[PDB]
């Protein structure tokens, strides 16, 4: 259910990320059109989300605050619409149809859905619904955002004042730090009302954090390169977060005998340094009937090996999870391969007083982008099969239905874990996803401005980690604490020739700081950053800072090293990412 929000959601997302940045005015005008139709075509859309986070929170919005959110939605529709077919006009024609009469049409059509946005959002924000607005409330902020930006564009052109552009910007910038911190404030007070001991608990726990990292957290990572005047050009950049579908089970109630929240929660992977899905080894174990013609087989534990991001090649083996195989063992290989899709089967077994169920086969689709070729590998049990119960794509929908899945999809498997039910009763698998924008290669872009996510380092040092993310920044981040390096990560140049660059880092800082830039094993850039939060402050929006190195560079080699100093005893030093600018 609610894999029609969930596709809405992802498609934006995907769509957005190729209109981030300073945008081309045909690909702007493009992504409206379908923007208008997937998010602003009628009320379904809005009713559906504030349906959507009701049965996740089993809760339900006060029909008077839920009759006044849709009211304000249906005006704000029109308001966009006028402007989209008004913008789509002023593109289409020529500089020469440009009269004076005409930008003041477009101006105030603009104007009119700027300003209806700043009086309806709170009708999205009423005391005590927070929670349960938030997905209407993310994309209605989007669509704020994403409009104001248009006024640095176009604003010149349609005839407005430098102070108008101005005010638009202020605007602009006071909308996205509060928009973000709205956002992270509310999902995190969901999840914690959410949390408890049971199994059950943890799959609608887990539930949330995926539907709510889909259309809302994915969402406001993007907020801060709709700043057109900091991103003149075209940003390539990536959402590098975990997603962990619904457990795999064979029944729907598990009288008690589900792992218990915290041996779920507990054991999932802790913030680690991006990796790809590498081996699987399926253990198998037999399940007797009580008549002996109603066994079957089933997955019963398994071991996953990943390799680590690009400039690394050896092989991290995960310990064993589940049980021993009383079976001969499966393995199945990805070297290469995109794993897009996962489609199980389970089976159960009824005794006079137990039911005993589990995974019988597993089918993955896979796609190799280097020989153009999509093709299957699978787990069969070999006993009893039984009929597909699990398609990761009812969770993981893919960005688009018009193409075919294996270019299409949004998400790719990274890891599997097998989880013991209570009281020796069975196994049930658990799988982790990553999103499709991830760059294998961490290539720098010779034409746009480059975002690179410090987790996609291969090489961690002097003691600094991968820790959990803000929330707003699309993964995790790198803390260090001590004075020394940091990170290393390899760098993929897309041109031969001795192209320049300039480099921009997005930190946080209990002290003013030193940061320095070496590439295989050289210095190159060495600058002074300022101190951005006190010891003990939280993470929020205005706690990062975006700041550019002075000189320029060429990438003289692939090895990007970056080395902090100028930190005391009790200091910490947050890196997210780090930007390259092509530069003449």
Request: glycine share 6%.
């Amino acid at each position: 259910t609610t894999k029609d929000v969930i596709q809405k959601g992802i498609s934006v997302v995907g769509d957005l990320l190729g209109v981030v940045g300073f945008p081309f005015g045909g690909a702007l005008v493009s992504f409206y059109t379908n923007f208008l139709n997937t998010i602003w075509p009628s009320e379904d859309p809005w009713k559906a989300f504030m349906e959507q986070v009701e049965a996740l929170m089993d809760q339900k919005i006060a029909d008077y605050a839920k009759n006044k959110a849709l009211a304000e939605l249906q005006g704000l529709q029109n308001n966009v619409e006028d402007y989209v077919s008004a913008l789509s006009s002023w593109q289409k024609n020529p500089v020469s149809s440009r009269n004076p009469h005409s930008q003041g049409r477009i101006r105030e059509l603009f104007s009119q859905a700027e300003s209806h946005f700043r009086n309806s959002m709170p009708s999205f924000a009423i005391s005590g619904y927070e929670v349960l607005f938030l997905t209407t409330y993310a994309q209605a902020a989007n669509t704020h955002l994403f409009l104001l930006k248009d006024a640095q564009i176009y604003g010149e052109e349609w005839g407005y004042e430098k102070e108008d552009i101005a005010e638009f910007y202020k605007r602009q910038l006071k909308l996205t730090q509060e928009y973000t911190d709205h956002c992270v404030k509310w999902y995190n007070v969901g999840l914690d009302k959410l949390r408890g001991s049971s199994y059950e608990s943890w799959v609608n726990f887990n539930r949330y954090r995926r539907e709510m990292t889909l259309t809302v957290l994915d969402l406001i990572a993007l907020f801060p390169l709709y700043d057109v005047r900091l991103y003149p050009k075209e940003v390539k950049t990536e959402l590098t977060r975990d997603v962990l579908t619904d457990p795999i089970v064979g029944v729907n109630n598990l009288r008690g005998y589900g792992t218990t929240f915290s041996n779920i929660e507990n054991y999932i992977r802790k913030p680690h340094l991006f990796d790809y899905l590498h081996r699987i080894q399926f253990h198998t174990r037999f399940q007797p009937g009580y008549y002996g013609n109603d066994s079957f087989n089933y997955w019963s534990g398994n071991y996953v090996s990943t390799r680590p991001s690009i400039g690394s090649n050896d092989i991290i083996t995960s310990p064993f999870y589940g049980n021993k195989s009383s079976e001969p063992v499966q393995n199945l290989e990805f070297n290469g391969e995109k794993v897009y899709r996962a489609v199980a089967n389970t089976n159960l077994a009824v005794w006079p007083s137990a039911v005993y169920s589990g995974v019988t086969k597993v089918e993955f689709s896979q796609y190799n982008d280097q020989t153009d070729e999509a093709s299957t590998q699978t787990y069969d049990s070999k006993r009893n099969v039984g009929a597909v119960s699990w398609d990761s794509i009812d969770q993981l929908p893919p960005e688009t239905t018009d193409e075919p899945l294996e270019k299409g999809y949004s998400h790719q498997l990274n890891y599997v874990m097998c989880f013991l039910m209570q009281g020796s009763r069975g196994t049930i698998p658990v799988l982790t996803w990553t999103h499709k924008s991830v760059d294998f290669f961490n290539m720098i872009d010779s034409k746009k401005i480059t975002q690179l996510p410090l987790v996609k380092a291969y090489k961690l040092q002097s003691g600094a980690s991968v820790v959990a993310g803000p929330r707003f920044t699309g993964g995790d981040i790198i803390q260090c604490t001590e004075n020394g390096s940091a990170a290393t990560i390899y760098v993929t140049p897309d041109v031969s020739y001795s192209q320049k660059y300039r480099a921009r880092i997005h930190y946080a800082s209990t002290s003013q700081i030193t940061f320095t830039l070496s590439l295989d094993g050289a210095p190159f850039n060495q600058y002074y950053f300022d101190k951005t939060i006190n010891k003990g402050d939280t993470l929020t929006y205005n706690s990062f800072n975006l700041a550019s190195f002075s000189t320029p560079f060429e990438l003289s080699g692939n090895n990007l090293q970056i080395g902090v100093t100028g930190l005391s005893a009790g200091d910490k030093v947050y890196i997210d990412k780090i930007e390259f600018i092509p530069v003449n």
